[PDB]
Structures are given as structure tokens and as C-alpha cells.
Amino acid sequence: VHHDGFQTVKATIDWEHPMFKLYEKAKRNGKWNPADIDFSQDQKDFASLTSEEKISALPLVAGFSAGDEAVTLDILPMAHALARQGRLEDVLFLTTFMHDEAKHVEMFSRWQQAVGIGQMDLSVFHNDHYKRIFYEALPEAMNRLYADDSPEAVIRAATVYNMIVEGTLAESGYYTFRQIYKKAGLFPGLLQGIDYLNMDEGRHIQFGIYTIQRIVNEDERYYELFIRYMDELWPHVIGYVDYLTELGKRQQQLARTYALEIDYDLLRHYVIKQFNLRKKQISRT
């Protein structure tokens, strides 16, 4: 439908808006290019591994590659809905958000190509719980915004995307990568990429916090919805974590070879801790 006018003709950008400030930071801190990462040592590492060691790393890469691809596609409805509400500074920031996720897809796909597994179908490592989050609940909640941009809908979208997928699962994934392979001295290019992703992610999570809090600020009963939507998804979060844990416990050879005492119970407590601290970053009042 028609534009009735344009904010930067009638006035200017709201230079003090929190999302204009986050946009400015995204530009300053978002120059990294996956095409510049040197994966040559990663190719040698992967080739040096036994078949049993090779498998160890793939479940986590399968979760990230599909996850980054899903969030690249699935942020578009949020950008649309806030655009239609006239939230110009949010939209500007979301152009950095979307471009970040494109680079994330690129990074994991470059790693897979470089180490020689691009032709391998890693979908085998998505269990039913993962599919419920990433194949279903995430696209459902985001696409809803095209026909329903009510405060409830927007809260639910930000909860699933920014607070669960990013703020709980992605953060725990970055922590897991470091805990395992940074210890081993394995895959330096991938770990460089992970550091860049984890930096981008701080802004993504802050968008979600801002968005949920500004709706809760209008009506503190939306706080209860936020908690409810977090708890609805917890069973699939932990069901995926338990599945990856079980895979890790069955395939021990990378841990033994590289003298990693992989503390799966500690990783599980990191996930629980992530989930709970995301809840605490939203104030009921």
C-alpha cells in the first residue's frame, strides 16, 4: 500500500534512538568478511582425523549451518512488520542484522567446502526437537507478523528468534565450540569465524531485548507472555541438547586423542544458565 510520507523528508533520523545507536555500532564492528578467513590449516586438521574423530564435529556444524540459514530467511517478516509501523531506526539496524546472518551462512558453508564435506548431507544430525524449533516454530512465529503484528505476536517472534535460538542455543554453541576445539588447537579458521559470529550475536540479542522490553513497558502483563513462551520452547531446547550430548558420549575418540575431558554436564548447565539469564534481562516493570 502507498507511502503517506517519508520521515527523512519531513524531519530526520531520530539520532538518539537506541536502534540507531545499535546500527552505528553494527557498521563499526561488522567489517569482517568470511572470504578472508584462512581455512588451509582446517583442511589439514580435518584430513588428519580418523573417521571416528571426523564425525565428532559435524553435529554442531549441522546445527549451526541450518540455524544460520533459517534465521537469514526468517528475519525478513520482522523487518517488514516494523517497517509498516514506521520504526525507521529499527529497520536500518535490521539491515545490519540480516547481512550479519548472510555472512554466518557463508562462513559455515566455506568451512564445509574447505574441509571436504560440502557434498555430505548433514541433515542426519537434526533430531525431532531441533526440527520443531528450526523447521517449524521459528518460521511459524516470524511469518505470522505478515498478518498479525500485535504486541503478542511481536513478543513471541523475538522470544523464539532472539531469546531462544540466538540467546540460548547459539550462545551455548559458541561456548561449546571454544570449550572443545580451542582446547584441542583444532580448526583455527572456524574458531576465528566463531569469534566474529559471537560478536555479531551480541547485537542480535540486544535487538530482541529492546523489542520485548518496549512492549512489556506498555503493559506489564506481556511479561507473563514472554515467560510462558520461553518455557514452551525449553523442552525442545534441552531435548536437542540431550541428543547432542548422547552423540558426544557415544563417539569418544576425538576427546581421547586430544586429551579433552569434555564436561557434558557443564555444557548442559551453561544452557540452563543461558535460558535463565535471558529471562532475567526482561524487567516486568
Q: Which residues of 64-80 are buried (b: 16+ CB within 10 A; e: fewer)?
A: bbbbbbbbbebbebbbb
Q: Name which of 106 and 242 has its Cβ closer to Fe ion.
A: 106
Of these, 149, 166, 210, 225, which contacts Fe ion (CB under 5 A)? 166
Q: Does 199 bind a copy of itself (CB under 8 A)?
A: no
What is the SS3 assignment for the chain? CCCCCCHHHHCCCCCCCHHHHHHHHHHHHCCCCHHHCCCHHHHHHHHHCCHHHHHHCHHHHHHHHHHHHHHHHHCHHHHHHHHHCCCHHHHHHHHHHHHHHHHHHHHHHHHHHHHCCCCCCHHHHCCHHHHHHHHHHHHHHHHHHHCCCCHHHHHHHHHHHHHHHHHHHHHHHHHHHHHHHHHHCCCHHHHHHHHHHHHHHHHHHHHHHHHHHHHHHHCCHHHHHHHHHHHHHHHHHHHHHHHHHHHHHHCCHHHHHCCCCCCHHHHHHHHHHHHHHHHHCCCCC
Q: Does 23 bind a copy of itself (CB under 8 A)?
A: yes
Q: Does 3 bind a copy of itself (CB under 8 A)?
A: yes
Q: Does 204 bind Fe ion (CB under 5 A)?
A: yes
Q: Does 38 bind a copy of itself (CB under 8 A)?
A: no
Q: Report what 35 binds from Mn ion, a copy of itself, Fe ion, none; CB cut-off 5-8 Å by kind.
A: a copy of itself
CA distance 205 to 195: 16
Q: Name which of 66 and 155 has its Cβ closer to a copy of itself.
A: 66
Q: Does 76 bind a copy of itself (CB under 8 A)?
A: yes
Q: Name which of 87 and 278 has its Cβ closer to a copy of itself.
A: 87
Q: Does 16 bind a copy of itself (CB under 8 A)?
A: no
Q: Report what 241 binds from Mn ion, Fe ion, ligand PLM, none; CB cut-off 5-8 Å by kind.
A: ligand PLM
Of these, 54, 103, 104, 236, which contacts Mn ion (CB under 5 A)? 104
CA distance 255 to 65: 23
Query: Residue 161's closest CA among 152, 151, 170?
Result: 170
Q: Report what 218 binds from a copy of itself, Mn ion, ligand PLM, none; CB cut-off 5-8 Å by kind.
A: none
Q: Report what 239 binds from Mn ion, a copy of itself, Fe ion, none; CB cut-off 5-8 Å by kind.
A: Mn ion
Q: Report what 243 binds from Mn ion, Fe ion, a copy of itself, none; CB cut-off 5-8 Å by kind.
A: none
Q: Does 278 bind Fe ion (CB under 5 A)?
A: no
Q: Does 96 bind a copy of itself (CB under 8 A)?
A: yes
Catalog residues that contact ligand PLM under the rule CB under 6 A: 60, 63-64, 67-68, 71, 101, 104, 165-166, 169-170, 172-173, 176, 204, 241, 244-245, 248, 267, 271
Q: Which amino acid would we find at residue 173?
A: G
- Total residues at the site for Fe ion (CB under 5 A)? 2
Of these, 41, 73, 239, 281, which contacts Mn ion (CB under 5 A)? 239
| Residues within the interface to Fe ion (CB under 5 A) | 166, 204
| Residues within the interface to Mn ion (CB under 5 A) | 68, 101, 104, 239
